Paper text:
The UNC-45 chaperone controls myosin function mediating the folding, assembly, and degradation of the muscle protein. UNC-45, which is present in all eukaryotes, employs a UCS domain to interact with myosin, a central domain that mediates oligomerization, and a TPR domain that interacts with members of the protein quality control (PQC) network. In addition to functioning as a folding factor of the myosin motor, UNC-45 can form linear protein chains that provide regular spaced docking sites for HSP70 and HSP90. Structural analysis of a minimal chaperone:substrate complex reveals that UNC-45 binds to a conserved FX3HY motif in the myosin motor domain.
Residue numbers in the entry: 1 to 222, 230 to 309, 335 to 665
Write the structure that this text describes.
């Protein structure tokens, strides 16, 4: 099994998983190939051949069950720990060796480390020590036992600390040692050791520019002392240096409020983060970190809120961040963070308009569309929250780059409680969510006098059920908003009017009687909405108006509410429109009330001089008194 290795490490065209079909031969293929590897890994080849080799070895390694065929691999891997380009592949290989016979892998590793220490003690140069600390950092999170034993030993500390002190400008050794310290901070005993014995050294190397970032990354893992780290990450990110390490750090650290206030305080860094997010060059992993930072820093508390709105307006809105984000390629996690950003920005109603102009509504809708049959998780909910807030404060038809705002409606309906015969919604929405959904729906229902939304409601019986199920909600604001929604939907008969005004249908006639009672709701906004339902339909659909004119409970209730509450202007107007439509359609209804003297003198009081923008009050009082006159003469 010789030539297979040559074609495996010969060029990137061939693949190992490819020629895995030519392998097989478990008695011979694995053994023979391992002998080829052993003779071949006896030297260091260029980065391409080595990358092929350590991409391929893990497979074979995972297979071969005879441990004495995988011995040499420990030396081969540890002796390449300084080779950066193939370091993670080595890790993978070691992990594969670790997956089966873990203990023997770690044992051979410890033995090789001890020989490396002896070689390092006899080296007039630092090259053996570099190798040793690179091997230690490479295998530390998998061989934690032997690595902790090495790091903690006086013999290893002696040579390490001494050569560090002596060779402060051996950048490869210092850097290897700082990466070692960071990685090794995983274990607790090592962390205590580092935090008891290295603070002097770390303060020292923190003063040296070319080691500042790596030293800060060690210090993170162990107030003023922290503040200096954060200022380092911020300044070095704003410069442009070590985008990867700094963004990772700050994405973690912006989980703390003080870090956030500092970041928002530093202008240059904010411009830099926005420009990096826009920059077509930064890696997708850095883009993700940048977005995590932006979402953390833009989040409203539940730091001073005004600082957060100032930051969001200055750097996210005015730098057209949302308009750009529409165009960058986003993973699902990055899209999640962008939804977070949009949500945060909309916590300040004054910005929603601008957000929508930059395309945020579109991003919300696409996000929901793609998650619809996929992941109704917390980001789904968050997206619906942002969308509801959007639709409460903007004109709907100019809100999704000329896409249909009505496409939001199915998503809004997911924050309405389903009829309680209808499963559990994956969405953990609250009463506030339901309230805001109904506000947004009420806004959608203004389009084309409610026909568009009503047609969406009629295509799915569930939607109308979830509305009707809020007619008697115990929360005043939900009941109020429901009635406002229904009254907007009653600007066009379509067929939704049958829900209340098809008297041949028992269910509808019952809903009618309920509505008549709702005319006397204590909440004046609810009352206005109920009145507008009746007034809209009666002034707009003459068939229904003829039927309503015969419904004595409605007429008596409307008159009672007019007698006792006519000093509210919207309510008075709507009751007058209802009553006059009814009376014009039915002289026998007029004859019914011709002797209600209190009704007559309330009507006369307004036939005089209504205030405000109110021609209808005198006009309609005049009409009604005229009909009563008709009946008395």
């Amino acid at each position: 099994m010789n030539k297979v290795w040559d074609r495996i490490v010969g060029s990137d065209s061939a693949d190992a998983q490819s020629v895995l079909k030519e392998r097989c031969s478990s008695p011979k293929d694995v053994t023979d190939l391992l002998h080829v590897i052993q003779n071949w890994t006896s030297e260091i080849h260029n980065n391409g051949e080595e990358t092929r080799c350590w991409k391929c070895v893990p497979m074979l390694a995972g297979y071969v069950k005879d441990w004495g065929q995988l011995e040499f691999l420990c030396r081969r891997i540890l002796l390449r720990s300084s080779i950066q380009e193939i370091r993670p592949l080595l890790l993978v290989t070691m992990k594969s060796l670790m997956s089966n016979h873990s203990d023997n892998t770690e044992q051979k590793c410890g033995n090789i480390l001890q020989q490396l220490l002896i070689e390092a003690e006899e080296d007039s140069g630092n090259v053996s020590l570099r190798l040793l600390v690179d091997a230690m950092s490479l295998v530390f999170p998998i061989c934690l036992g032997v690595c902790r034993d090495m790091f903690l030993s006086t013999d290893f500390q002696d040579i390490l600390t001494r050569n560090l002190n002596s060779s402060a400008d051996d950048e490869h050794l210092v850097n290897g040692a700082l990466r070692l310290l960071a990685v090794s901070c995983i274990d607790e005993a090592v962390r205590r050791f580092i935090a008891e014995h290295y603070l002097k050294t770390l303060q020292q190397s923190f003063k040296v520019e070319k080691y500042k970032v790596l030293t800060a990354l060690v210090l993170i893992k162990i107030k003023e002392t922290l503040n200096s780290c954060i200022n380092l990450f911020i300044d070095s990110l704003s410069n442009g240096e070590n985008i990867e390490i700094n963004t990772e750090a700050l994405a973690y650290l912006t989980l703390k409020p003080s870090v956030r206030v500092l970041l928002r305080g530093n202008g240059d860094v904010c411009l830099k983060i926005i420009e990096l997010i826009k920059s077509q060059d930064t890696t997708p992993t850095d883009l993700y970190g940048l977005l995590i930072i932006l979402a953390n820093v833009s989040e409203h508390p539940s730091e001073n809120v005004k600082d957060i709105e100032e930051f969001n307006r200055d750097y996210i809105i005015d730098l057209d961040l949302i308009g750009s984000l529409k165009s960058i390629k986003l993973s699902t996690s990055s899209y999640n963070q962008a939804i977070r950003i949009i949500y945060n920005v909309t916590r300040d109603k004054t910005q929603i308009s601008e957000c929508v102009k930059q395309g945020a509504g579109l991003m919300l809708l696409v996000f929901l569309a793609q998650k619809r049959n996929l992941s109704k998780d917390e980001w789904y909910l968050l997206s619906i929250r942002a969308l509801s807030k959007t639709l409460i404060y903007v004109n709907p038809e100019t809100a999704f780059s000329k896409y249909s705002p009505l496409s939001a409606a199915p998503f809004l309906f997911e924050n309405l409680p389903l009829p309680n015969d209808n499963a559990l919604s994956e969405l953990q929405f609250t009463q506030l969510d339901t309230y805001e959904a109904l506000l947004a729906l009420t806004n959608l229902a203004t389009i084309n006098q409610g026909v568009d939304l009503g047609k969406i409601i009629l295509s799915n019986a569930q939607y109308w059920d979830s509305i009707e199920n809020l007619l008697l909600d115990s929360s005043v604001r939900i009941q109020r908003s429901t009635l406002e929604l229904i009254s907007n939907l009653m600007s066009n008969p379509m067929a939704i009017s049958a829900k209340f005004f098809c008297f041949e249908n028992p269910k509808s006639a019952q809903n009618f009687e309920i509505l008549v009672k709702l005319l006397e709701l204590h909440d004046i906004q609810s009352q206005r909405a109920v009145a507008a339902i009746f007034a809209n339909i009666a002034s707009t659909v003459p068939f229904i108006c003829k039927e309503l004119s015969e419904k004595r409970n409605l007429i008596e209730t409307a008159i009672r509410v007019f007698k006792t509450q006519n000093t509210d202007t919207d309510l008075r107007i709507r009751l007058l429109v209802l009553l006059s439509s009814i009376f014009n359609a039915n002289a026998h209804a007029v004859a019914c009330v011709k002797n209600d003297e209190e009704f007559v003198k309330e009507l006369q009081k307004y036939r005089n001089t209504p205030s405000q923008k109110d021609p209808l009050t005198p006009e309609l009082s005049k009409e009604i008194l005229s009909l009563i006159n008709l009946e008395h003469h």
